[PDB]
Amino acid sequence: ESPIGVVVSSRRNGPWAELTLVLTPQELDQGKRLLLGELVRVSSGGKDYVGMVLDGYYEPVGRSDPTYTLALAHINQVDLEKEDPWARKEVNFYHHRIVLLGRVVQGGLFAPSTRLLPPVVEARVYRMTEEELQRLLAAEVRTSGSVKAEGKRRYAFGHLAYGLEEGGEYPEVVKEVDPALFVGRRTANFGKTGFGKSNENKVILTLLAHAFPRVGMLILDQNAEYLLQTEATTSPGLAQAFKALGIRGRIRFYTAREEAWARRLKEHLGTEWREYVEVLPLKVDFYHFPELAVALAYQRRRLQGAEPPQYLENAFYNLEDWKHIPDRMAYVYGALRKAGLTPRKGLKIK
Amino acid sequence: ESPIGVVVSSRRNGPWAELTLVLTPQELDQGKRLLLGELVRVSSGGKDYVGMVLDGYYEPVGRSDPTYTLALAHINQVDLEKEDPWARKEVNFYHHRIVLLGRVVQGGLFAPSTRLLPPVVEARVYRMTEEELQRLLAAEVRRRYAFGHLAYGLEEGGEYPEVVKEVDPALFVGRRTANFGKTGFGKSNENKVILTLLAHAFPRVGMLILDQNAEYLLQTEATTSPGLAQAFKALGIRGRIRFYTAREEAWARRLKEHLGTEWREYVEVLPLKVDFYHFPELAVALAYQRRRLQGAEPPQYLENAFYNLEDWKHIPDRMAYVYGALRKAGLTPRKGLKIKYYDISEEKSWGNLQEAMGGARELYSRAKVFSFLRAFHAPGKEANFLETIKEDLLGEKTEGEGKVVILDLPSLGEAADFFTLRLMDLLFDRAVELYGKRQANFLVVLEEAHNFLEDKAGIFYRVAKEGRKYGIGMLYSTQSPASIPMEILSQTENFLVKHLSSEEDVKVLKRAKAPFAFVADFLLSEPIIGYSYVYFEPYQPFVVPLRVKLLEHVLKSLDS
Amino acid sequence: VVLEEAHNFLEDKAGIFYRVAKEGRKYGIGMLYSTQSPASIPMEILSQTENFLVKHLSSEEDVKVLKRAKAPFAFVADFLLSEPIIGYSYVYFEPYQPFVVPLRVKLLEHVLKSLDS
Q: Which chains touch C (3 or more CB pairs under 8 A)?
């Protein structure tokens, strides 16, 4: 509950106000440190600002020659810690750079940046507490002189961390998201492969399903990972999440391997899985939809030369007119039969 | 009244003169400060200049080692305020930079910049008063409505509700206005205020609003900010709004709810149907777009037609094939239409022509490519909204008195861009035809401008370049200024800039206009809603930061 | 609409998926897309996205496009290049979030276990 160091300078660098902090031998020996990207509190003239640690470097303080001092101590086989602490007290300093992001005012509004530059003798830097971090992660930009809306429920999405350093993780400082941020808007999930994309997406989809039961989803499962846990992991899928949450009759799974998928669903959801997932086929009878077959054959790979066939082109448009003439429809049905599509039992042409 | 600090240096830094100010420990202890971007008075040699605070930094004064002194005081557990009043007296200085913008002369005129550089012992810096700020905001280089009031960020002591900037709503008529800013920071309110002021002040100027977001007619489902129809109802303007849409029933159900049972006195709802026997270029282009979106590789005949229909228009043999293609697709023509391969409208001559009958020949067979056009097809010329809007905005009978045409672009789906481009081209051609007899005298309200101004061979680009000759004004919003050509950026007359999320977007502003060099850094790190930087050429000295008034208050002031 | 490997579908500016990503907000259609390569996504789509969840990226081109699209991501671009941490994300939701937030995202197991209480 004390200042971390001493502020020795401040200025305006580009669009941001920054200040310089010096950690002295007392702080350094007591094990006090600042992490890059850490959020701190800055008090200046009875007002609190949010600051971020941007830099750290070593510089001499006063009239000293740290290189010569340390080299001489090393040469003379002198231990600075146990022996001769007076020379160790004059080199044990460190410098940090801190940017002022803004401040929290009124009932949680965020006022960004600042137009007031703090004098050196006024500013002080404090380590932010857990409650302050919780109140800071909930601040939002808003119209001045208004009142926060409040209301709709929020869910925990993650907790604050500063990398993999010990002491840089705050399991109690969670960020809570209103799932309405995801409905009707665009979300981008960037990053390399294998770093958490699937878990993030599944959490988002589960939160949407729990909070907005009237919003549907169309998932184009290219990797086959949004229904059940994969053999190369044990993270549950949407079907298991919905079974845990008690949501029935919402998942319609369209596939062409219904037997295998139902086999897996039986083992992963029990004998009652028909109440949570509904399996449907991705196969069609081309004798009922000859236009689909024509379009498929017309829009195929077209290796090398990109010239669609003229006969297929003509058929693509005129097949709808041909349907009123059995003499013309018999050729299409015979084409399918000769290609090798097994018809129904009792299909009759004229 | 006394000077703030002491001037210790001056110089010329590029196209401007600047000076350095120092605040001493006594003044700092008294609580005196300078806000960045604040306007101050500079007295030098009997003359008064306007200055702006650009910078602030800490620097040692005299012979001292502030870092060593402060570190040692911290180490020894000493309180400077109490235990050592003298150690705190040698390190408590602060430095500021002030740029001289010009001076106010004679009868409220402004002389920009300066050619004299003040000696250090002559200059003094004073804090502006409200009367001086009011007189300075009205100066120009050579009725009105309140637009906003002066404010410096969100800082306490940086807002002046009485320092109001008032604009004559004639700097918007016939000129170019740019509205830049991130989404959700005041663009809608600013645009609606400008349009309401224009409508009230000049009842003889028409508007063409290309409403991509459907937000200008009625209050949206998010906020309660009044729409333009409700503003007109409040102001008592009758018989001026023509709303073209493809969902007249749905829109008339909302209009009654919001405007009462008399809503028909303020708005006329009209359909958005066209005739493809008179605009077959739209048919061909829409078919071409409808392909390559459900796949790829538009056919050779379709690609040929898309480019050579204009040449086909002079060969009746080739034109008849396109007309027959539309007729087979099933678009009802108007009675009396004939081709010279025949009364295509007549139910019997069509059979003879079809039995009687190249790229056009190939396109004839594939007649179903136009089927979807039946969604927005209608025969005749009274149905043609392209013609109806043309007479609404440039009619011989409807001279003056203004008309506000608003398009419901979303209801058009995929054809909105083509329809808008065709309408703009038609209107520009008519306005060029009318030159020498009367002026077009209307304003085009364009959203997502970066999509239409990108290419220099476009109708909207040509309108931006040459509209001022025929009295056509433009008001465009883009949110991404870096996508707008620098010629248009430099030729634009009015600028309203809000918080921008891109450094390149901020940079282009200064590269286009020099006076915007002093606010670029503020724009990139201050997400404030309703806070704008305004610059109206050619009589405004410098950019002014404003809190813009709301439409509700503007209406409440206009009523009385 | 939940779409994977969005760079295969959003690159074509005459395509239905580009059209949906550009105009779907007018009809109440959202989109959630994952690419692992922002430099491939068109800048017009990037500038119009609302929510960002960014994990480790190994390409300076990707970091440059990220910072060009969204200025607030300039404070963490150096961490993103040099720190391959699994489960560590930088989140930014528009338009009223002050700064980008680094998070350990909760696991689905924990979310399910806490949603039943």
A: A, B
